[PDB]
Amino acid sequence: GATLCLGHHAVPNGTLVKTITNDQIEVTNATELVQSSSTGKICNNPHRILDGINCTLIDALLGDPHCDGFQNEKWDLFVERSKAFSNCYPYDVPDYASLRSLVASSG
Amino acid sequence: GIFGAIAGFIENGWEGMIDGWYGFRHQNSEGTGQAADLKSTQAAIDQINGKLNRVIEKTNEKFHQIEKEFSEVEGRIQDLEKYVEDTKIDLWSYNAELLVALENQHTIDLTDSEMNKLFEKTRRQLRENAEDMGNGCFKIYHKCDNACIGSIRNGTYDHDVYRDEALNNRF
Amino acid sequence: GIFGAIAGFIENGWEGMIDGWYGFRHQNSEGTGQAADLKSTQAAIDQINGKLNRVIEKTNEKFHQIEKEFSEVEGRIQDLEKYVEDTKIDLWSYNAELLVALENQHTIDLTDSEMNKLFEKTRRQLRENAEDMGNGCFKIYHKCDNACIGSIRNGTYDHDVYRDEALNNRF
Amino acid sequence: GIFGAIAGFIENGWEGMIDGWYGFRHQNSEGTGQAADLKSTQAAIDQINGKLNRVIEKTNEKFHQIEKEFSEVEGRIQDLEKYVEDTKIDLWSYNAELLVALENQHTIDLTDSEMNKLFEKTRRQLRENAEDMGNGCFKIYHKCDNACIGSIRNGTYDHDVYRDEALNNRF
Amino acid sequence: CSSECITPNGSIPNDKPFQNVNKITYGACPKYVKQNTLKLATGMRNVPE
Ligand SMILES: *[C@@H]1O[C@H](CO)[C@@H](O[C@@H]2O[C@H](CO)[C@@H](O[C@@H]3O[C@H](CO)[C@@H](O)[C@H](O)[C@@H]3O)[C@H](O)[C@H]2NC(C)=O)[C@H](O)[C@H]1NC(C)=O
Ligand SMILES: *[C@@H]1O[C@H](CO)[C@@H](O[C@@H]2O[C@H](CO)[C@@H](O)[C@H](O)[C@H]2NC(C)=O)[C@H](O)[C@H]1NC(C)=O
Ligand SMILES: *[C@@H]1O[C@H](CO)[C@@H](O)[C@H](O)[C@H]1NC(C)=O
Ligand SMILES: *[C@@H]1O[C@H](CO)[C@@H](O)[C@H](O)[C@H]1NC(C)=O
Ligand SMILES: *[C@@H]1O[C@H](CO)[C@@H](O)[C@H](O)[C@H]1NC(C)=O
Ligand SMILES: *[C@@H]1O[C@H](CO)[C@@H](O)[C@H](O)[C@H]1NC(C)=O
């Protein structure tokens, strides 16, 4: 006579995953659902990125001289750097956050 | 799993089977052989993909949102902004943990299921001409050459042909 | 599904069976017949309802809440109100999508289960007097008239009565 | 459950079995006996614990948050603080209700599964030497003393030994 | 270079459902979670011998 065997495959290197009943259990393959890394660069496409360089958005708005390059500019995303500084008459904006927001949003 | 086939009554997997997820090994007069079952392999892969595509699907696009970091202590409103963001993150972190747990449990169970379904399909084909050896192998009580084994694998096996022989050898 | 009965080893459904979800078709000396199995039909319907009632249940009552539309640009606080509402809607949208996917998967699986359970129950009744033909039909190796078929259906079949006859015809 | 063993083809549970979750009761020439199956009992307990540990696990630590009660009517911001907290509570209340429903459904199904798996394992051991009586009892067609029953229970039963006797008594 | 999702750390790929990079994002972005990893099983239980 003959013998017929039913079987399933297996692999040398398996992967531990987590289930309802099981904290670690080995399967043949798994895929990662959490992105943990970055290339490190803000990609200039496909969004119009405006690098503010030494300028904050508010100074660009007001017209601080060293910001005058930003006149009439547009952006999808305005990037403010930490090195930014104000060179003009010292001022303050009550509810600075809101002006910043609504201008940033107007774009 | 839940059907008790994989890591079940089937002792272990075959690292040697590289052309499919599920298959047959046989031994008969002519020698030993191995072949993958592509339909059930496909069933498993299809399901897993379906689910993979459910989850890996397009993310949500968001543009202007609330501020999530603060350089000054402001009290109440910042307390609220912070609390809202923290709440959101906790809830999604929960959804994700659970999605993975459920999904994985189910994948394990469905792959077990496919195995068991192949076994069952085969047993049913063989009718009275074979016995379940409990290890996931059938004992075939008639003379089965490579063509015959093949006929079992592609689903064309005619049991009535060998029934007399097999019946004879079983008892 | 997960048991491989529906869309399984059972080729297809019967559009002709309008009195139940699961049943028997038979062919014997006297002719052909069809009858619904009401207990297992009920099992399925009951579960599906239980679930339907879990979901369709009373909604939540809310009265005065935050404002969700705005005619003026206000900045920070409006950003926050908007963000909170948007966050909530995304989270519930997720719960709903998932509830439906899970629930549906499970309904498919549980109806498959009921079918397979009926099959198994019946096979067990028949003992040595019939064989599994693999298509979801049993071959009964003794003489079974409409009363006998009935006895199988209502669970009163006594196998010992026909065992000799059947055993004889099987081998 | 989903396998139709517990509250299934197995009529009811044994309040008399206090040393395990699943076991055997037997009757042979020497008398009647009862013994627990510790492996499958363990399988069930282990899973249930895994799950219990998933849920009962460390809670989240939070310290300074938004205020959730108010002694004065303030309008807009309070509306918002209130709405945020209410939103959070409704979502977590949902998560908890569902967690429990799913988890429980699954526990019921997995304990049913374990039972059915033990049954299947045993049937496979016995080969041609016994028949499924449908009530979760096997009829053993040869002479089985307490040692033999034991051998069935600890998985060492050699069917080939009794096959001739049993085959004889079956037909 | 190109990418649909921007974070203060740099751009990140949006192919996955979730990300640990930053709670601050712009564009089509994985939802942000506290876990640095969640593996979704793509095959059966592995049982070597
Ligand atoms: C992407 O960007 C964020 C923000 O820049 C990075 O998070 C920062 O990571 C560092 C290192 O893990 C954290 O340092 C820690 O600070 C805590 C709190 O003061 C301190 O107790 C620890 O000893 C440790 O030094 C830092 O807190 C954290 N910053 C924030 C605001 O979260 C993140 O690491 C970056 N991820 C990638 C992929 O580059
Ligand atoms: C941003 O501001 C910095 C600092 O003021 C500028 O760096 C100066 O550059 C000039 C011209 O190259 C040098 O002579 C100075 O030595 C730099 N100053 C300091 C303090 O480092 C920089 O030019 C500005 N960047 C842009 C594009 O406007
Ligand atoms: C692991 O799974 C991923 C996603 O399904 C797939 O792209 C990859 O090919 C798999 N790896 C192997 C070796 O099967
Ligand atoms: C199955 O195998 C037999 C013998 O090898 C062959 O003749 C037949 O064509 C096959 N059937 C199918 C549908 O592939
Ligand atoms: C089952 O069928 C038999 C024969 O038709 C009938 O005599 C008997 O009463 C039925 N049993 C039940 C419980 O309905
Ligand atoms: C099973 O039972 C037999 C007879 O009682 C005994 O000899 C044997 O050692 C047992 N096997 C194991 C592995 O416990």
From Swiss-Prot, chain A:
Name under which the protein is recorded: Hemagglutinin HA1 chain
Glycosylation sites per record: 13, 29, 54
Source organism per UniProt: Influenza A virus (strain A/Victoria/3/1975 H3N2)
Superkingdom of this protein's organism: Viruses
Disulfide bonds, paired cysteine numbers: 55-67
